[PDB]
């Protein structure tokens, strides 16, 4: 229960490795969905649930549209997965081996640098308000409605101008 966050971070690294290795975009979207779920779990473990659930929902919608698009136009007769190419699968297992080697090197040589296996699970939650109401992560995002109205208006104008932009690009 100490290395739970580290296991999640390693799974996120593996998912990003597969996404970098670039299979067919169906499998790329699958890896991105798994990475988004893992990142949601990481934000959940580190603190408020709202940011993790938000990025989860956003990436579910995004990879849904991506799946529709890759079935539309970014497809091939034989879609390429991680196991179809010997070079891609070799790069996958080599990246896993390199990750294990790098975390062992940072455990041994660098001592307490970025990775410490003895200190793992000790520095996840630094300071928490033991007694207290109004502490959850969604309240800051709510404070965007009051404290950062400039942030609110630039986000809203980004979405509005984006609607106009996509209409003009796909106007044809």
């Amino acid at each position: 229960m100490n290395n739970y966050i580290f296991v999640l971070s390693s799974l996120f690294l593996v998912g990003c490795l597969g996404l970098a290795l670039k299979p067919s975009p169906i499998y790329g979207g699958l890896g991105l969905i798994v990475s988004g779920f893992v990142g949601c779990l990481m934000v959940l473990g580190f603190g408020g649930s709202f940011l993790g659930l938000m990025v989860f929902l956003i990436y579910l919608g995004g990879m849904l549209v991506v799946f529709g698009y890759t079935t539309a136009m970014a497809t091939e007769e034989y879609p390429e997965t991680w196991g179809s190419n010997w070079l891609i699968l070799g790069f996958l297992v080599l990246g896993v081996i390199m990750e294990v080697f790098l975390i062992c090197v940072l455990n041994y040589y660098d001592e307490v640098g970025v990775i410490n296996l003895d200190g793992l699970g000790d520095w996840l939650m630094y300071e928490v308000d033991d007694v207290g109401v109004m502490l959850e992560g969604g309240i800051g995002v709510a404070a965007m409605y009051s404290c950062a109205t400039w942030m609110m208006v630039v986000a809203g104008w980004s979405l509005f101008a984006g609607i106009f932009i996509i209409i003009e690009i796909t106007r044809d």
Binding site: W150, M151, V154, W157, S158, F160, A161, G162, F164, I165, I167, E168, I169, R171, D172
Partner: protein, 345 residues
């Protein structure tokens, strides 16, 4: 484009760099960069040809990658220092990543490979909007963090920018590619003077903008995209040859044109900071830039290339295209050297 979407797109194009320059927060500067990129893509792809589609795609992926590296630098600084500004003690790796990503957004060598290609295939007014307006916000971000940057990496980027711009402008015949390599060389000069005196960076930027604007307007008069196309300008608009020659010589940095002033004062400041080798190499590559400008002048003004038969009908027709702001910018970019102490601060 209906006027509603014209107003929305042009207002967001304007608003991007304005937010970037006025923003205290690095995140708001970043979203200003996002505004500029997203708003300028549809006007790039507005003509809906395969070349415009390729140019828009290349520009999008390049600026998106560079903006992601910028966001990485911002998030790493926020992790290290807890604030949203590179104050004084941010990591040199973070600052170098910021510089590298902003140089890829600007389009200076060796990150320059997309800029002649994006400048090609888009209309001339969009090339003007790109090569003048799109560089102000990244330069503002670089200017805000001038004492923190690394002089070695900046000078290397600047010298390779001026070298590659000189060689590319030497090779190309397409006018948009020539202007893009000119942009690369002048961005190299601006980056070279950036860590020592950003006032000279702003001066060189303003001189380059007021020199680039009427050259693009004169190209926009007849849609002359080629050396030959600008070479038969004597039959079409004979009254513009002198101003074309003067503006190209000012771009070359020849005295007594006012375009000699940015190179002169940048060299002076580098000599004050004891970078004589860099200054001399930059000046020689600026001579190469002046060479391809002079070949352009030979093609369009000093000689007279053969004309066509339909140019008689084009002379029968009348035009109202050159606007009121062309001559003001041409004169202010040609004959303003005696006001050099006023142009500098």
């Amino acid at each position: 484009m209906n006027p509603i979407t014209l107003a929305i797109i042009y207002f967001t194009i304007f608003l991007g760099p304005v937010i970037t320059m006025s923003s205290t927060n690095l995140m708001l500067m970043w979203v200003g960069l996002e505004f500029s990129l997203l708003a300028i893509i549809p006007m790039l792809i507005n003509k809906k040809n395969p070349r415009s589609t390729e140019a828009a795609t290349k520009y999008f992926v390049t600026q998106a990658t560079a903006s992601m590296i910028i966001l990485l630098a911002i998030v790493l600084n926020y992790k290290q220092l807890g604030t949203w500004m590179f104050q004084q003690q941010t990591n040199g790796l973070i600052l170098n990543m910021t510089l590298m990503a902003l140089s890829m957004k600007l389009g200076l060598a060796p990150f320059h490979f997309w800029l002649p290609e994006v400048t090609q295939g888009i209309p001339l007014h969009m090339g003007l909007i790109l090569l003048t307006w799109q560089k102000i916000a990244p330069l503002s971000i670089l200017i805000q963090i001038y004492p923190l940057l690394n002089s070695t990496i900046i000078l290397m980027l600047a010298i390779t920018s001026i070298f590659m711009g000189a060689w590319g402008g030497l090779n190309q015949t397409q006018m948009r590619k020539i202007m893009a390599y000119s942009s690369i060389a002048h961005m190299g000069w601006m980056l070279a003077i950036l860590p020592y005196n950003p006032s000279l960076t702003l001066l060189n930027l303003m001189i380059y903008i007021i020199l680039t604007a009427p050259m693009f307007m004169a190209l926009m008069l007849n849609n002359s995209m080629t050396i030959n196309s600008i070479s038969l300008l004597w039959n079409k608009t004979p009254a513009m040859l002198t101003m074309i020659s003067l503006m190209l010589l000012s771009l070359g940095g020849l005295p007594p044109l006012t375009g000699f002033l940015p190179k002169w004062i940048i060299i002076t400041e580098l000599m004050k900071n004891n970078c004589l080798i860099m200054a001399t190499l930059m000046a020689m590559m600026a001579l190469l830039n002046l060479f391809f400008y002079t070949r352009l002048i030979y093609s369009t003004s000093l000689t007279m290339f053969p004309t066509n038969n339909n140019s008689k009908m084009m002379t029968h027709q009348t035009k109202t295209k050159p606007n009121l702001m062309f001559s003001t910018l041409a004169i202010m970019s040609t004959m303003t050297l005696p006001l050099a102490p006023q142009l500098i601060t």
